[PDB]
Amino acid sequence: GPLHMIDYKEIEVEEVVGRGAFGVVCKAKWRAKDVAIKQIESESERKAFIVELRQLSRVNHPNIVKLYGACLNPVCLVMEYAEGGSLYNVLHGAEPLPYYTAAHAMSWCLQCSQGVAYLHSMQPKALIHRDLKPPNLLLVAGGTVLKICDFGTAGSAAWMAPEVFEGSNYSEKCDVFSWGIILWEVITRRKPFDEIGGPAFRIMWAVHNGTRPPLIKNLPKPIESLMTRCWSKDPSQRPSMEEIVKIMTHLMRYFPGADEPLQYPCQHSLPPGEDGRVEPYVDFAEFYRLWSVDHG
Ligand SMILES: CN1CCN(C(=O)c2ccc(NC(=O)c3csc4c(=O)[nH]cnc34)c(-c3ccccc3)c2)CC1
Numbered sequence: 001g002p003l004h005m006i007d008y009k010e011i012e013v014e015e016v017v018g019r020g021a022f023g024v025v026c027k028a029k030w031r032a033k034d035v036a037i038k039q040i041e042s043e044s045e046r047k048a049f050i051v052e053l054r055q056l057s058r059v060n061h062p063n064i065v066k067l068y069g070a071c072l073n074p075v076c077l078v079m080e081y082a083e084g085g086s087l088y089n090v091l092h093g094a095e096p097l098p099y100y101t102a103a104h105a106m107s108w109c110l111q112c113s114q115g116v117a118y119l120h121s122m123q124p125k126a127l128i129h130r131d132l133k134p135p136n137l138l139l140v141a142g143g144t145v146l147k148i149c150d151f152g153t154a155g156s157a158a159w160m161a162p163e164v165f166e167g168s169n170y171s172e173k174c175d176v177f178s179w180g181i182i183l184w185e186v187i188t189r190r191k192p193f194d195e196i197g198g199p200a201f202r203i204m205w206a207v208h209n210g211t212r213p214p215l216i217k218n219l220p221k222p223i224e225s226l227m228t229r230c231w232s233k234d235p236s237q238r239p240s241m242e243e244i245v246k247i248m249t250h251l252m253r254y255f256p257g258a259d260e261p262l263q264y265p266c267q268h269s270l271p272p273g274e275d276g277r278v279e280p281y282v283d284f285a286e287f288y289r290l291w292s293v294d295h296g
Helices: 046-058 089-091 102-120 172-188 200-208 223-230 242-256 286-293
Strands: 011-019 024-030 033-039 067-072 073-079 137-140 145-148
Touching: 011 137, 046 067, 089 137, 089 172, 102 145, 102 172, 102 242, 172 223, 172 242, 223 242, 242 286
Parallel strands: none
Antiparallel strands: 011 024, 024 033, 033 073, 067 073, 137 145
């Protein structure tokens, strides 16, 4: 649809806000509007650039970053600016970190699944993101609205389905695995496979052998089932994104307050796992109370 060929002179480039999965992202102004501009640095990043330009111009969804246009002198994309930064920074960035609730955690994952389900429903071919992870998930509207970005492939071993790095043939089900890891990550406020570390191949080996993130103490059984289904070794046993959207949509009845902006401070550090399980960062006592009222 609407896509502007942009004269660079019209872009007032403010500060560098970070590096995307490729390129460099700057806060900028264009037509008196706040935008993000993504510029390639290397000549190698040109492939990711054409891919992203093609893919992002195809897509129109509330949970996918808006592409306003492109400049070719110099080669850069002009996109929606995400004032809340990345989910990864919200979760794991420098202190002070924001407080967030079970409702936020569930809402972010629902919104991610809605974006990805839209991708998987594209005609004539499904669009696969292939690099779903909190660095590539952005927040707007006081941290309450999530948008997928970094479509240059449409650092990442901790979210990658084992069939992807096994060089095996794969499908949209790879995004489902990634989503399952993200669900664990927002609930625990832990970096997946942080304890392994090393170089990437050590994570790949672990996941390849069936290592998954530790189970979560007092996690509601339906959330646990959904999570562990998503990270099945066999991609055909993983649910479709359409099913995840439906399940997560119905679960939100038991997670009111997702519309509350991130505004409260938090002082957060990690206790190690008591058994083989970890504590959730979020609290499920309210979920269980609301469930009990509804069911009996
Ligand atoms: C003081 N103020 C400074 C700016 N700010 C951020 O932290 C802050 C604000 C905005 C950001 N990005 C975007 O708006 C953005 C739009 S499209 C796109 C993409 O395709 N890839 C990565 N980022 C973006 C980032 C950021 C996040 C991850 C990687 C690179 C950039 C950080 C909030 C706090």
